[PDB]
Design a protein that fits this description.
InterPro entries (chains A, B): AAA+_ATPase (IPR003593), ABC2_TM (IPR013525), ABC_transporter-like_ATP-bd (IPR003439), ABCG_dom (IPR043926), ABCG_transporters (IPR050352), P-loop_NTPase (IPR027417)
Radius of gyration of chain A: 32 Å
Protein name (chains A, B): ABC transporter G family member 25
Oligomer: homodimer
GO molecular function (chains A, B): ABC-type transporter activity; ATP binding; ATP hydrolysis activity; ATPase-coupled transmembrane transporter activity; efflux transmembrane transporter activity
Family (chains A, B): Belongs to the ABC transporter superfamily. ABCG family. Eye pigment precursor importer (TC 3.A.1.204) subfamily.
Strand content of chain A: 5-15%
Membrane topology (chains A, B): Multi-pass membrane protein
Largest sheet of chain A: 6 strands, mixed
C-alpha cells in the first residue's frame, strides 16, 4: 500500500506562546514519536501539522512534499483523534461497511467497496470480533484496545499516505498497548506509510519500537534524532542517569528541570542539531447531484435503524403504556355516552398523555449525537440536509406503534362510537397529534443543545398547553383567550369531540363544551405545526459552526 | 507517632485458586510494595491481610504480632480503598472535622478532637486547600492527587500502626504520584508505622523509593527481598535484560512469561528464598447510650445540611414553581366562587402538582449515597437508625418552603376565601400532603435501590392516584370504588373543598362533588401515610447486609 510517498517539513512553527521554533522533517517510511510533559504542546503540533490550524495564529511553514495544505494532498492524510465516537448497536463488521459506503468515491461499484472494508478488518486483526457488537460502558461490547482499532480502520479506508495519531495507547493495558504499537510499526515499515504519533508515558520496550524521537519541553524542542542515540547525545553535553532507568523517563525529566539545566538544553540544541537539520531542509449535472443525495439518505436510514428502536422500545416505555391502557379500560369500563361529563374527561386524558409523552422523549435526540455529527460532517461523509431528514423519516415510523396499540386495546372496552369510520378517524387524529407534539421537542432540543435545561422548558410549555386546552377553566379572563390558539392540545381535543358527538344536537334530544371552531381549520393547523416545528429545528442546527 | 509496634506474618495463605502459598513477614518501619500483573491477585492479598476475608475460603494463618485478628488489634489498622467517597459541598477542613467528631472516642473533649483533625491536615500537606470545596466531576473542587490525601487523612485520625493501601497512585500524574509515595515513605521511616501498598505500574524513580518488594505471578510469589538486590538475584538463576530498562518492567515481564521460564521461577523460589524466610518466621447505663445517639444525629444533620439544599434549591426546580404560580394566577385571576366547576378545578390542580413533584424527587435520595453509607456504617461511625432519622428530619425542613411560597403568591390573586383562619387551614393541609407524598417516594427508592427503575413505578402509582382522586370519573364501575381509599390525592382534595365550601348548603341558596367522607377521618389517614411510609423505608434499608 501507498506507492505514492510523502515528505513532511514544518520549518519554524510558532503558535500564539505554545510553540516557539519547532523544526524537523519526516521521511517516508519512518515511525516518529512526539514525547513531552503534559503541557509542552505536543497535541498542538500534531493538529498544526495535519492541517487543523488554519493559518490564523499558526505562523510557520507547514509544507507537505515541498508544497502546501492544498486540498489535493489533504485527502491523502488521516488524523485519528483521542476519543472514540462509535454507535453501540452496530456490530464491528457493519460499522466498517456503512463507513466504506459513505467515504469511498461514488464512481465505483458496490463490489469493490465491500472488499475494501474487509481488507481493513483482516489487516488490523479485527477478524475475531467482527460479529460482536461494539457497545459502550452500558452495553457489553468489545475491549477498549480493540475499540481503538476500529477508529484506526475508519481512517485506512481511504488509503492515506500520512497517518497522524493523537495518544493511541492511553487507558490501554500493558500488553494491549504493545501490540498496538507493533501494528503501527508494521504500517510504516511493511506498507511504506508515514506514521507520526504522540505517546504519553511509554514503557521499557515500547521505546525500543520507535524509530525517531521528538522531545518538546514547553515549545522549543530539545532533540530530533533516531531514537537509540538519544542517551549517547546527552552524555556528550554531560547529563547521565545514576540508577538503572527507562530511557524515556530520563528524557521526560530533562524536559522539566529534574536532572541527575533546562536552559542549557535549549542553547545546546540551537548550536549542534539545528545547523544539521536545516542544511538538508531545502535540498455531472442535475441527475447526478440528486441521486447522490438519496443514496446518502438510504444508507443513513439503515445505519440508524437499530438506534431508533432502542429509543422507542425499551421495557420502561412499554410498561408506562401498558399501565395506562389498563387504567383507562378499568375506570371507564363499558362507559355510557349519555353522561357527557365522563366521556369528555376520557377524551381529554388521551390528549394530555399523548402530548406530554412524545414531546419529552424528543429533546434528547440531537444533544446525544453532536460530537459524532460534527466530526463526520467535517470529514465529508454527509451534509446536514441528509443527516436531518434521516432523523425525521426514521422517527415517524417507530413512534407510531405504541399509540396505535394503546387505542386498539382501549376503544371497544370503554365503548366509544361503534363502526369502522369513527375508529379510523379517531386513530388518524391521534397519530397526527403525536407527530405535531414530537416536533416541538425536536425544536427545543436543537435550539438549546442541553438535555437537562431543555427538559424543563418543555415542561413549562406543555403545562400551559394543558391549562388553556379547554377542560379545566370554563371561562377565561379576557386577556388569555388568545392563548389557546397556539396550543396543540386545543386542536386535538376539539377534533375528538367532533367525531364522538358531532354537531351536538344528537345528544340534545353543556353547549359551551360542544362549541364551534371548525373541523377543517383544526386539521389545517396541526399540519402547520407538523411542518413548522421541523423547519425551526433545521435552522437551529444550522447555526452550529462546526 | 505509633510508639506501639506491629509485626505482620501471613504464613501459607491460600484462597479459593487465587492465592496458592504466599508467605512473608513485614517488620515495623518498612515500606513494602506488592507488584504483579493485572490478575495475579494482589488485591486479594491486601484484603485478606487487613482482615476483610472472614476465614470462610481464606485457609491460612494471618497472625498479627504473634496473635490473631481479634478486635483489640483491628482498631490499630487502617485500610485505604481504591475509590474515594466524599461529599462535594463540604470544604476540606470541615470534611475532616465531621469525621473526627464521629470516629474519635466519646470520652474526650471537643478540644482535643479539633486539634487531632488539624494535625492531620498539616501533615499530609493539605494546608493550602483547606478552605477549598472538595467538588466532583461536576463541581470545580480540588485535584485528584490531593483528593487522595483526604482519603488517607480519613484513616490517620485514629492513629493506626498498620496502614494498608490499595493502588494509591492510579490516575495521578507523573509528579503527583511521586510526591505521594514520598509521604508514604515518610510515614514508615519518620513516624515508625508499617505501610503495605500495591503499586500498579511504577516508574523509574518510584521504584527507588521502595524498601521491600513482593512479586506475585498468579498465586505463588516469586521474590521477597529488599528491593535493590532484585536485579542481582535473577542473574544468579540466569535471567538478565538486554536493552536498558526499568527494573520494575523487567520483573513484570518475568511474572508473565516474557523473558530476555515461568515454571523455573516457581521451583527456584521454593528452594532458596522459602527456606530462608521460614526459619525466622517462628522466632455507662441508659443515660449514656441515649446521649450518644442524639450526638450522632446532631453531627449528621449539620454534615448533610449543604447537601439537602443543593437538592431542593437548584434553579431548575425554582423555575418550575415560579412558572406554575404565574399560570395559576393568570388563568383564575379574580375568580368567582359561585361558578363551582371552575373552583373545583383549581383545587384539583393543586393536588396533582404537589403530589407528583415531591414523590418524583424523593426516589433519588438513597440510591445516590449507598457506597458512602455502607463504607461508613461498617467502620463504626454511625448506625442505621441515626443515619435514617437525619434524612427524615433534614428533608422535612427544606421541602416545605417552595409550596409555602406557591400558596402565598396565589391565594389572593385567584380570590379564595378571605380570612386568616381559611388561609392557615389551607396551608396546613397542603404541607401535610407534601410530607405524605414524599414518604411514598422514599419507600419506593429504598425498596428497589435503582433510580431509573423506581422512577417509572412512582409514575404508574401516581397515575392511578390521580384517576381515582374524584374529579375525572364521576361514576366508577363498582369494582373500582375501593381504589380511592388508598390514594393520597383523594384525602387531600376532599379537605380543600371542605374548607372552601363547607357542608355545602351555603352555596345551595353538584352535590355528589361536595359529598361526605369526614374531616377528621381524612387528617387521620394522612398521618397514617406519613408515619407508615417512613417505617416501610426503614425496613427496606435494613435488608442490605453490608
Amino acid at each position: 500500500s501507498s506507492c505514492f510517498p510523502i515528505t513532511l517539513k514544518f520549518v519554524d512553527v510558532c503558535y500564539r506562546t505554545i510553540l516557539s521554533g519547532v523544526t524537523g522533517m519526516i521521511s517516508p517510511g519512518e515511525f516518529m514519536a512526539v514525547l513531552g510533559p503534559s503541557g509542552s504542546g505536543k497535541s498542538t503540533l500534531l493538529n498544526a501539522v495535519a492541517g487543523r490550524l488554519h493559518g490564523s495564529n499558526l505562523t510557520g511553514k507547514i509544507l507537505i512534499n515541498d508544497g502546501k495544505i492544498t486540498k489535493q494532498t489533504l485527502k491523502r492524510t488521516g488524523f485519528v483523534a483521542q476519543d472514540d465516537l462509535l454507535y453501540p448497536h452496530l456490530t464491528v463488521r457493519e460499522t466498517l461497511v456503512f463507513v466504506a459506503l459513505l467515504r469511498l468515491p461514488r464512481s465505483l461499484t458496490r463490489d469493490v467497496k465491500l472488499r475494501a472494508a474487509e481488507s481493513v478488518i483482516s489487516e488490523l486483526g479485527l477478524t475475531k470480533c467482527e460479529n460482536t457488537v461494539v457497545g459502550n460502558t452500558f452495553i457489553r461490547g468489545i475491549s477498549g484496545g480493540e475499540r481503538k482499532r476500529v477508529s484506526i480502520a475508519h481512517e485506512l479506508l481511504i488509503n492515506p499516505s500520512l497517518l497522524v495519531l493523537d495518544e493511541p495507547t492511553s487507558g490501554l493495558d500493558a500488553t494491549a498497548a504493545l501490540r498496538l504499537v507493533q501494528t503501527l510499526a508494521g504500517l510504516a515499515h511493511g506498507k511504506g506509510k508515514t506514521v507520526v504519533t504522540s505517546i504519553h508515558q511509554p514503557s521499557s520496550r515500547v521505546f525500543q519500537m520507535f524509530d525517531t524521537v521528538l522531545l518538546l519541553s514547553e515549545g522549543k524542542c530539545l532533540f530530533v534524532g533516531k531514537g537509540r542515540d538519544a542517551m549517547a547525545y546527552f552524555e556528550s553535553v554531560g547529563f547521565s542517569p545514576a540508577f538503572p532507568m527507562n530511557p524515556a523517563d530520563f528524557l521526560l525529566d530533562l524536559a522539566n528541570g529534574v536532572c541527575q539545566v533546562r536552559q542549557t538544553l535549549v542553547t545546546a540544541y540551537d548550536t549542534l542539531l539545528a545547523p544539521q537539520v536545516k542544511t538538508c531542509i531545502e535540498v455531472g449535472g442535475i441527475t447526478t447531484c440528486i441521486a447522490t443525495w438519496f443514496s446518502q439518505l438510504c444508507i443513513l436510514l439503515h445505519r440508524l435503524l437499530k438506534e431508533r428502536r432502542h429509543e422507542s422500545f425499551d421495557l420502561l416505555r412499554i410498561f408506562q403504556v401498558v399501565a395506562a391502557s389498563i387504567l383507562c379500560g378499568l375506570m371507564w369500563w363499558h362507559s355510557d355516552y349519555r353522561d357527557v361529563h365522563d366521556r369528555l374527561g376520557l377524551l381529554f386524558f388521551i390528549s394530555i398523555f399523548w402530548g406530554v409523552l412524545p414531546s419529552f422523549n424528543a429533546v434528547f435526540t440531537f444533544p446525544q449525537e453532536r460530537a459524532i455529527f460534527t466530526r463526520e460532517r467535517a470529514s465529508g461523509m454527509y451534509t446536514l440536509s441528509s443527516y436531518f431528514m434521516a432523523h425525521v423519516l426514521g422517527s415517524l415510523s417507530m413512534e407510531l406503534v405504541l399509540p396505535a396499540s394503546f387505542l386498539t386495546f382501549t376503544y371497544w372496552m370503554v365503548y366509544l362510537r361503534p363502526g369502522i369510520v369513527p375508529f379510523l378517524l379517531t386513530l388518524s387524529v391521534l397519530l397526527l397529534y403525536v407527530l405535531a407534539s414530537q416536533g416541538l421537542g425536536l425544536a427545543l432540543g436543537a435550539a438549546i443543545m442541553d438535555a437537562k435545561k431543555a427538559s424543563t422548558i418543555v415542561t413549562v410549555t406543555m403545562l400551559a398547553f394543558v391549562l388553556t386546552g379547554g377542560y379545566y377553566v370554563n371561562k377565561v379572563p379576557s386577556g388569555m383567550v388568545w392563548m389557546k390558539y397556539v396550543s396543540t392540545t386545543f386542536y386535538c381535543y376539539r377534533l375528538l369531540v367532533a367525531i364522538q358527538y358531532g354537531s351536538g344536537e344528537e345528544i340534545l334530544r353543556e353547549e359551551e363544551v360542544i362549541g364551534d371552531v371548525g373541523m377543517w381549520t383544526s386539521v389545517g393547523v396541526l399540519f402547520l405545526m407538523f411542518f413548522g416545528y421541523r423547519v425551526l429545528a433545521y435552522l437551529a442546527l444550522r447555526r452550529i459552526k462546526h
